[PDB]
Write a protein that binds this ligand. Structure first.
Ligand SMILES: [Cu+2]
Ligand SMILES: [Cu+2]
Ligand SMILES: [Cu+2]
Ligand SMILES: [Cu+2]
Ligand SMILES: [Cu+2]
Ligand SMILES: [Cu+2]
Lengths: 138, 138, 138, 138
């Protein structure tokens, strides 16, 4: 069976790819299915956060799988004013919410309670299936 | 003496003041001294946070006192890029560090550990004795 | 002709690849040959350093090209004792030599003058055709 | 008086000593004061680096003076990870910063600016007053 046991520090041309959500990209052992249909198992050393772009390889060196971050149910928070986001980041941080941070934009795992809370800060909160890359730590 | 038991919904006519730190403004029961030499006991309603500028009054509503936030030893963080202050606010939010958030500036109780950490983010941290008003929702 | 005009901040499943040496990966305008033969031209914003793993795409977003570091002539310096490697790293930095640093191995463009110098430090310098990813400081 | 014209490749019976910062230990023609009060004049061949512990002498070959490295203001980078130190050596090497290298620790003329740059590297940088013997090669 195809087992992906390593993440190459120096990539080699991809032979396959796999599109995974953040909850799977933090597991060291688990069964996933490549985008071409073949089953495969992750057998990586623990504590690795797989980011879109990383290349996994089988023990030998004949299979190089490109990791891609899947579209996940997230909440979006956009607003020209970064100061308001800064307060949102502090609030979300205080609640330990895995968060993606980019100039002008913020996303986090869909959660109604969180949505409405920020919906009292006056913040604009939408929803959509998008790639999710939270800041390291979870 | 004079008893302060309520906060007027509308900042009335001061005519006296009292300087208090963040740890005393998060109290409902406490005996203080007005900047004018008189003594007054604070008997405020539970579930409250006194902010600088606030105006306290007695029950019969015939006396008014203005609250002034005291100076405190804080680490100061100033930066031009709102993106970086956001990342800092999140990391600080995660450590449950009470924090005063402002456009382009952060303030928290002086801490060398937190200081070096933010320095690793390329932020420049300094020291100062300043009024500290940390976010209510923290 | 096919033109690659950008590096997505978020990789997408690659539909092709391109294997280039460090000197080319630092350019913004240059013609190249993808691994499937279809020639293509780079039209990227100046200032970028293409790293193995990056994904390039056009404007339409229908083509995604993965960059792979090409084998190049390099001097190979292997040595267990890290301490001695640190002294070589310092000496090479001093001479502004672009250097790849990994535990137990350093790599730089094949150069005899530098090969004889390190040899006097008691280092064993060999040769090879390998991927070269130097630190972003040269 | 006494004129020190040479460093012995054959240690002798040092009578007195002189404490100097690397600053003065690079000069071949400087007037110093032994720790006993007597003056001495260094007239050594050019291009010499006096190490704490060397012994100087007069043209005669009669008297001797031990060199001691003085305490200087230095930054300290103590990291148990040899891999990270090597990278630090490289960056510092690129900036032509005189550096003392040891397993687990690095030292160089204290410098806040330079310290912060190394902090962004994820390294811990402390301060000290210690002898300073930077690599001769630089
Ligand atoms: Cu929902
Ligand atoms: Cu907590
Ligand atoms: Cu301090
Ligand atoms: Cu050769
Ligand atoms: Cu230079
Ligand atoms: Cu200092």
């Amino acid at each position: 069976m195809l087992y992906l046991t390593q993440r190459l520090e120096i990539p080699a041309a991809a032979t396959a790819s796999v599109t995974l959500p953040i909850d799977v990209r933090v597991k060291s052992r688990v069964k996933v299915t490549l985008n071409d249909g073949r089953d495969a198992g992750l057998l990586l050393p623990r504590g690795l956060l797989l980011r879109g772009g990383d290349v996994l390889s089988n023990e030998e060196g004949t299979e190089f799988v490109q990791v891609i971050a899947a579209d996940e149910e997230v909440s979006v928070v956009r607003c020209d004013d970064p100061f308001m986001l800064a307060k949102a980041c502090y609030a979300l941080g205080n609640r330990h919410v895995p968060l993606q941070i980019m100039p002008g934009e913020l996303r986090y795992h869909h959660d109604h309670v969180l949505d409405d809370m920020l919906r009292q800060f006056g913040l604009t909160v939408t929803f959509g299936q998008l790639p999710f890359e939270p800041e390291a730590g979870a």
